[PDB]
């Protein structure tokens, strides 16, 4: 049997097993369930051919360390590589060159509305802006203006506290009731609002909670961002190998983890002891591509269920359990964004010749957002080799666009990098994916890039993977929560979603770091404490707030917000008005 | 007593599919059709907005292109039964009639793209004023224009291709079907010209990535172009043909057990009678203004010969049966798109746009209303009130979810405002229709705000009613169906209406037809498959002339023979002379 049944082997399902058995492993049975045959989940680090210090994360790439204060920043995240000891590196978003004065990213392109510009050129010259916005919103880079909207709907809504920012009215009603768009088309241009859109991940929102997106201004080059040397996979593997490494247990290491396991049901049994039927159902990974083996069956029991899974997930299991109408009505509260990635290798850096060198250039063309990722022979002691790294795709957006169709025709072998005559074959270059670049991708994200960097023939690339995130059984890459949902809450409840039932919900949709990792650690560490009863670790501060405090039920005319430094702030949002002006 | 068959969906497509029947071979079996709701006509929904009782607000279909004169042409399913039922038939104006002697058409009409204001004449007067960073080649040509200059540009002549010629069309080493749409566009435009299409031109947000062979020749949206509307409203022929059905006279089952209505089916399921292999277990649905929702009573169960499914995509999808298994039905039901459709109309005592020199058509913006639609004054029409109401259609956009007309669907109802036209008449708290869906105090109000800036207008007088609808929600999921590329709908076009043969179900409906978006795709669909599957005969209406699908290419487009061209020195020449009109 089972007292301990954790499905999902991402960084909240590896963690929520390694702390458990690490505890009381001794004194409970505890079996984390995954359906492919990789540990990480959205989580995923290759390492290409000449780049073995070039980690091309398909996943997750940069978290924000902790402050002084171990109030701010993704402490979780910081602390835990702490206790595990992987090795850290700063995720680059802008030029160190010169040392002087970095042009961080000042330098960087944008390519909207065929024509080419870049990030100084906002402030310093917006005559070159193609957007027809107002003369009140003329002279703000996007990311500042997306803080003018802010502080004008209300000064320091930033600084409130979410059970503060929940009860916050523009125009009449509360933010969370508006998307992002049905606000920013209230206070922006249509001029100002299609900006921001071409220049954000068109999806960027979706019409998430206005409350969850409005102050998303930590996309910064000013902002600090830390990766994992070993590629961010190596923090939910390195959760899964300790997790059976764990001397001792009522369950042996390798009996621990049970891979190419579908969880397809959850059964109310009798036994009191384990009233969890847990059909789960045998599957098959064959390059990446996870399908099912028929056979049926596999029903372990289970006292308690842990699913360190995204809505999609949770959608496809059936349980009667899911019939709860607050949990029916609830894993609807957030939304599925499809996420794409596409890396391209080269020999060269090409793009250090033009001025760029890490983050990110803009456009209205189909790749949207391009990427500087790194060259090995830079990364410390690694090869001595120019072969560098573009990770060209980010763009995200739902249903069919460009990136999910031209993923038919031939496949692309590339060719062999001098570097690696002597070493690798040509059918092993381009790697086995569960999606397979063709020959076709390749030549057009080509000709964008070249576009984006107005040259007229760019060196091609040897090397290229293509991935996607729309696929179940994740739907998609990132979750955002809806309007007119009360996430303060959610967030608390669907921890544990139905009060009689020992089932519970960790992630990073159901999470207020949405799209963040340090979003799956917290939902799964604060759900271990206030109910699986596992005190606070030692690496994690006293101070780290995991989950933010709730509003209350009744926000139908609550007690007004008393302002304290209201000085400050106005003294604030004025001053920041003159950085246009 | 049990049935010899069950047309299941109340569509245009299903009220045709019994009719006929019935009609011919209905004292020979046991024909009874199945609704969901308390509505028959299915998408196709003609509600009259108070104020404006001879101002019809299609909310879902509208017009229909009349038939040709050699009949292979038009929409000439839908054209001759508009007669053969008799149903009244008015112009569908897309321009202006007046001046009465230089009749400027959709020339006029609006645009409002990137914050530049601009006319549809501006695009062949004055290119200057278009805010598009298109290329010297592109420049000069409008959306229409372009799509053809672009079709030509591929292989000249595509839009004389039968459907089974145009498939073997490669572009660039590819069949044209592989392509998307856009995918497409972004190698023959410049992503300025690619841009600016996608924001003009047809429908709106939608022309998705579809089947390249069906989005192409989709240029017939333009302001040459005849259409009809049924005076009556397009739910009329849906209508009449319920009515028709259940008023044959030569039946086994009488006219008051023929339309079975509030019946939704859950499963279709192979029984055991060896001669109605279908237990249909069915469920009660009640249906209390517009939403219609389950009475858990019980599964009523009704023994069936065949089953003629009229549903869409969704529809379908939401049938549990082992039919749904067969691997080609499994893969083949996502040979099309889903796509959500929107709409919002607002109704107003004075035809401002008039006062502004726009009579009838679309207006085109960067808003998220995105179009606009001037539909008619109720004095206007035939025979109608001596009141200037008049009714806007819009919220015509389209597109997958969370936009910004579904982020307006909540606060509190419009209850709109007694027009003088209907003082004691009707009362405020009846002048909103009560709908599916109730448009808000909020949602009229932006609405208005974005009209009135499309227009270029200081304020608007205030509209006194207002309703919004989507086809966003199951039992649709969708408000019409777009073909996927990488599928050879030529062979689906045939296979949808026998899925599979042993077993026999007919699955009827736009959903699978060339006709996609259109009501003769509906018609079309149901017509073959009573001819081939049910052997009835063509109708007196229908001309042989006009092929009701069309023709499938062979299974093997591997490397097939060269399609033979034709009059070059004619065609070539068409193409050239095309390309003077842009320079
Ligand atoms: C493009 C992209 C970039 C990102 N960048 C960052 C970033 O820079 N920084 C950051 O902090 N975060 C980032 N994230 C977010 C991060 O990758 C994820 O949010 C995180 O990995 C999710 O962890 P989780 O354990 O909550 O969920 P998952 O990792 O999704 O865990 C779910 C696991 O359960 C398995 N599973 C699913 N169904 C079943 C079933 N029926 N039975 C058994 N197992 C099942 C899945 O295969 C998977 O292994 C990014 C995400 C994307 C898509
Ligand atoms: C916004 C919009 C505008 C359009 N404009 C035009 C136009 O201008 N001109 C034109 O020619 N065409 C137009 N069309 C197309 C037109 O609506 C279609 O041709 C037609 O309505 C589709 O007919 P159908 O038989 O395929 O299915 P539908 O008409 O969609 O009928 C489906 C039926 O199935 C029923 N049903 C669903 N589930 C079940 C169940 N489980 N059991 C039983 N019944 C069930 C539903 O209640 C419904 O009655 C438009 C469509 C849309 C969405």
Redesign the pocket.
Known sequence: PLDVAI???????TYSAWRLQEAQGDHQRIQL????DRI????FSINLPGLPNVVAEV?????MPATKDNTGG?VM?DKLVGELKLESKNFPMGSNLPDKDPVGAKDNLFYLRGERFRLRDFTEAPDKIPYKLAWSERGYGPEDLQVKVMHNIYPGFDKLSLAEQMQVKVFGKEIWRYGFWDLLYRVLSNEGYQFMKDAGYEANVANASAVTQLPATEYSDKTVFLTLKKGFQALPLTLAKRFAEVPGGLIAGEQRIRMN???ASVQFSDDTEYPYRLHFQATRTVDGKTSDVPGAEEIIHARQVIL???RR?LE??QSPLFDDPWLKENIDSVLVQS?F?LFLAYEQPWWRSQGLVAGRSVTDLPIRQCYYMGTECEQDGGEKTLNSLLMAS?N?IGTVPFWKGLEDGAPFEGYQPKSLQGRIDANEVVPKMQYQISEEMVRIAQRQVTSLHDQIELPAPYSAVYHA?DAD??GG??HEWKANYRLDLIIQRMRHPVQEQEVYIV??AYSYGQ??????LTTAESTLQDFFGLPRPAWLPEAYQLLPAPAPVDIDNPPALACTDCKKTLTEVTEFAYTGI
């Open positions: 499905i999902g082997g991402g960084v909240s399902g369930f995954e359906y492919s990480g989940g959205r989580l996943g997750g790439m940069r978290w993704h995240v396991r579908r969880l360190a899974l995204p997930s496809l299991i996420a990635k980010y995200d995130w059984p994740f890459g990132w992630g990073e799209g963040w990792v340090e979003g799956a």
